[PDB]
Design a protein around this ligand. Sequence first.
Ligand code: H2R
Lengths: 267, 195, 169, 835
Amino acid sequence: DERLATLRAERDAAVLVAEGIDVTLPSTRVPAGARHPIIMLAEHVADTFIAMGWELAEGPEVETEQFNFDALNFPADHPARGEQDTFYIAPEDSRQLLRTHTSPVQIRTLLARELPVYIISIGRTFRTDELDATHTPIFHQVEGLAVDRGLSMAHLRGTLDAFARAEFGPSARTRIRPHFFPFTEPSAEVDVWFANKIGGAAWVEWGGCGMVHPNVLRATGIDPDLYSGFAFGMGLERTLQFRNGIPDMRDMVEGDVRFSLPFGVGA
Amino acid sequence: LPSTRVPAGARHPIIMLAEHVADTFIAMGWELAEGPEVETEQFNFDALNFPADHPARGEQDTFYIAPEDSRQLLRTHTSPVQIRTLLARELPVYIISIGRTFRTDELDATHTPIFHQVEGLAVDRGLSMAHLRGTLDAFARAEFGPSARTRIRPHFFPFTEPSAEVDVWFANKIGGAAWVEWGGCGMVHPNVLRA
Amino acid sequence: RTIGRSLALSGYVEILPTPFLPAGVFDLWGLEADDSRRMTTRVLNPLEADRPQLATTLLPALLEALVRNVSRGLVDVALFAIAQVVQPTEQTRGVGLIPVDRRPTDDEIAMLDASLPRQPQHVAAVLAGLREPRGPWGPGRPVEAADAFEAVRIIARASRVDVTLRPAQ
Amino acid sequence: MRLPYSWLREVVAVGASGWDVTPGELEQTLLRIGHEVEEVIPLGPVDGPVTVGRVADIEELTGYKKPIRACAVDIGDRQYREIICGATNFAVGDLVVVALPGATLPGGFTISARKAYGRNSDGMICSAAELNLGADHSGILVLPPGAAEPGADGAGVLGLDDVVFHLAITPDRGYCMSVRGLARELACAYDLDFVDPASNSRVPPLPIEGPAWPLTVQPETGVRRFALRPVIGIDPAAVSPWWLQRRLLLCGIRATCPAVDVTNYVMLELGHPMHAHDRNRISGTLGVRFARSGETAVTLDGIERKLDTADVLIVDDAATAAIGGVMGAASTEVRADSTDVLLEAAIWDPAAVSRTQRRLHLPSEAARRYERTVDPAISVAALDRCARLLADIAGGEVSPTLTDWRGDPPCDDWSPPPIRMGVDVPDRIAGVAYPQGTTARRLAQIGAVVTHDGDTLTVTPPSWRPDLRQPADLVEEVLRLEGLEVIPSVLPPAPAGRGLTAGQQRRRTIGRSLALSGYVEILPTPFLPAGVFDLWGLEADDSRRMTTRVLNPLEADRPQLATTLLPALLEALVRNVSRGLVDVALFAIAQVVQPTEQTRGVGLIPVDRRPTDDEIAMLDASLPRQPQHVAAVLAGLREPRGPWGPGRPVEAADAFEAVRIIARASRVDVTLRPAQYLPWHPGRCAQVFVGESSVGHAGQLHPAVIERSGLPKGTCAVELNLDAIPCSAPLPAPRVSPYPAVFQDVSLVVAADIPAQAVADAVRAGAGDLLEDIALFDVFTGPQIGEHRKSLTFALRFRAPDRTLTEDDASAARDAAVQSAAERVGAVLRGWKLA
Ligand SMILES: O=C(Nc1cccnc1)N1CCC(Cc2cccc(Oc3ccc(C(F)(F)F)cn3)c2)CC1
């Protein structure tokens, strides 16, 4: 009985190889989908600020002129309030429009909540740009507003640097140069030092920032002698374009599954 | 007609509770830390101001790694993670550690030898019991609703001084709101900071 | 977030939907003249003269992305979108300038809000071609209505609610 | 710890006469200053005729299972009642407590004159438990002679309007294990003047004239004080008065004889354990010393104890007199005939007592107090208090001799070192601005000496508070007496944190993705099943058998910690299947334990500094590797039955798809390669790779493993090492050409052993960038292509980046793909077509 079992065993071992399969055959009968890369960028931006104690606010894309322009210290005859740059709701002089930034959300939030306020608003915004490689009439913005006692430009720079590190890596930082916006004073443009890549690190313009203008605080019932605030905004499509090196914005907006699927599921 | 040919699954309710706890503290600026479940006695007991002959260091309450006197064990809390984090990182530190912990309790309706804990540690200049209570109340509101709050009564743990037990006012339900004991807290003991 | 994750894991690809409706879409759909979806907010200065109406429904944008994928040879497609729509309840009514040297009152805020179209959040999806692809397991399975019902169930599980489905025209 | 309110009240009332509070308020005050009240027990009410009686006759009823007594009982005014009773711990002449017809006992028991055991019984003789007076023990309650006359009212004699508080004292407050300590705490909480019951006005010192007994002490035993005093000529027949027996009973101690009763009583009153030796049973000098290896002692319960060389003993010339601080020995124990007593008031080393009693499982009333440090300043006060009480009760004489060893050299000052603290430190720690004088006032109340020097306090705690060593200890005293409820709730500003790590996010994404695909997560036990790797048939040298072992597992046969998550998952699978849920997919994400050497401990690093970087690395290196794994098991139907068809059983391909789900969730590419690796089926097992690194295995389990383990047929499994899957943060920039595509199918014949993916790779390498997509449609075998060959049909999609591909440019790319397959895997073209 030495060898009843040795080749009773190697019988059963060949039964096992006879039922072998090719383990490399495709197995995916439910192909993966994909959340949109702009939505996923927005999600990462939101988490970056949630993790610093901020909250997210939302508002309507069809907005009053009051909150889109007047509460934001735009003069009555500012060119932005025209049809050349802004989509207006018919008929003429209806004081209703597609919002040109997400700032009306921060106005609404300042009216609704108690101070201090640290609010991110991410959402869809609209401009009369033709669709081409670097423009789209429908785009997505992130804007932040922090209003508290004793906030300074230094806190603005700290928040901007934290933000930059989260989206571009531990070597990123920002620099600011003086500029002008109606709703900030002082105002600046933000460049980000994009080290990780680009084909050779360089400064890239990222967006705008400044100290919220006292007229904006007054129009929300906030005393600018007690409270100060900083603000900033960046475009998500523009950030994705220069960070990932995506040469044609049409790909971000046209809905071809081949653009989305390489970004993964986003779960 | 039924349409579901790929039935939904489920993440575990304890994991999902842990996830919600973690998000609650991430949203206040804290971070999460992890560590090994088989731990040194140094970090599980000695760094936490347990006397050498404290009964917790015995086989009656703690799983030890064979052989005897190996100074190796299944951790009895997640505190060794905060010790490791205090050694590794610069101050200030605001750290949550959620993870699996082990006790020699028989499995029954209200005990399990394998359980999961959340512990938090905040170390900074000028932190007080008032900040402890504020963080505990925020935590309670997130897990039990806007009407929840906590109360503290004096107690004792080797690693805190003063020490307290935490009750949570569980309004939303229970069959009639009442105080429920939730856990322990206190000011981290100076010997823990020294070590 | 949970709805998007759940639809993406189940094979749907998210698009960003344009709010400018296609020209004549509701005549293509054969909707009645008094269908509420025809009551659209209109943009005064659209980039395309024949597309000035803002979307009351997300399906037109999704079908337009679907046609684009299909015309490029990607015929087995499942798309979804999560976005607000614009549903006016009256003719365009503006609210006059409130002085900016003070904050608006609660009544002024409610009046500004009441003057805007309703703008609820919608989720929508479209499917065409093969739901299950062809492979060594067999010929695959074409999209059927039951796949749209299952998308409802995916969204309901993601929302932690129970739904029922009822025949409708 | 149990004590009656009346006693506690009496001690508080000396310094604050009239003090009296309801049980509810007392409970609340004790909770707020830190004492856990486990139970408040009002001595259960009685109503009606529950009175003292005197047993005047006992007749033994025979013929029943138990011994039964018919007793004539004198109930007052020369009235005698026949009462049936089953107890035996009483004799003619004893005072007892009778509940007579018409009485109601706690718990709603009405007494009636029933007929029992053949006779008529006018009520019952009561136990202490039936009166809700004290612990339920065998037999009825016998009051000591002269306690009351027959007919006296039971409730009043027994003191049934008292309330017993059952507390759970924390180990940092040993001083609270006595009426002395709790009364002092109450005095602090209520701002009362306090008269210490251990002080000299309350315990006037006895004479000190010569040694009471010859004593040697080896001081490295940690004894701090050892005092002796004799009482001679006590009457061995005397019993403790009722007031004393009662207080002992309410604190959970049964009275036995005055010499023992008095030591228990004074222990409860002052917190200093006491012991009574029969002096005539002591032979020669009393020695305090460590036990020797193998030494034995018989404690006064008659049990023989195996001692340890760290156990401290009291011995004489002949035998052991005590296990010091734990339990007295039989050899010097007070007995029924003991007439001359040597009283022992000793202070033992807390840690020494703690180790010894836990080893012997002797958590005595003395040991539990010594463990928590007994106040060394009151040993002679407690000794003197105890000698007077014994002489008074049992009619002896207190000898004026006293031995009082106080260390080598003698110690005459017992308070801890002075502690030094800024006057406003409690205010800062509490976040509360207390009124001026608050911390200094509270620290005096607890008994410390407090001096002011500018803004710095110098605080010398009392000798009964060895826990007060650092400023934090003093903060706790101030904060708990003020009340924690005054501390406000103030959210701190936490810093700008960085959120979840990449690893943490990945483990969330993997769980979400597996759950959406139908898997149910379990929490896996790390204790391996008994013999699991023999069930699996693993080789003796398989690394998975090298397990870390637990010394004290809850199940003796499951001491090994899991090197693999599959055993826990299969155990949950069997459980689901045995309950009728046979179509199941489970997953787990958890660490495993994989030792690299034999258990090696690292010696204690001093805790007065931080460990060095090298010490930290050494601690880490001593631990087993503990990587994170993800694993899953599947059995039964993968797709359920329904109107669409019969459903689809789990197959190995479902385990491969789980690998792909995890890889997509991780944003990495995997390849799968045939492998032979138990417990998988050798023909249906893939090893998983990311790049050239192995990250685990997947496929169908081995049918022999399935059968030996009682698993469902066809069970499949996956286990991946998450630690081996590199982090990845891709930044995609996909090219999306809008030009039309060209569709072609190609069928290639290859040896059966060639993996389909190798053919697809070769086709891809030859076709170049024009190839946008390749998918395997058909695997066909048959005699006309050769017995050991197979035909693979691939769907190819070609697209140019800048132009419409001609159908001839497409065919050029197809030709190159066919040629590459020919050169790499020996493929032969069977045919192609436009799709
Ligand atoms: O996105 C962009 N341009 C674009 C154009 C086309 C396509 N893509 C992108 N830029 C260019 C313009 C710029 C404007 C700006 C400047 C400074 C702070 C900002 O943020 C605010 C402003 C106000 C407030 C409030 F508090 F007052 F309400 C709060 N935050 C916003 C944002 C980035």
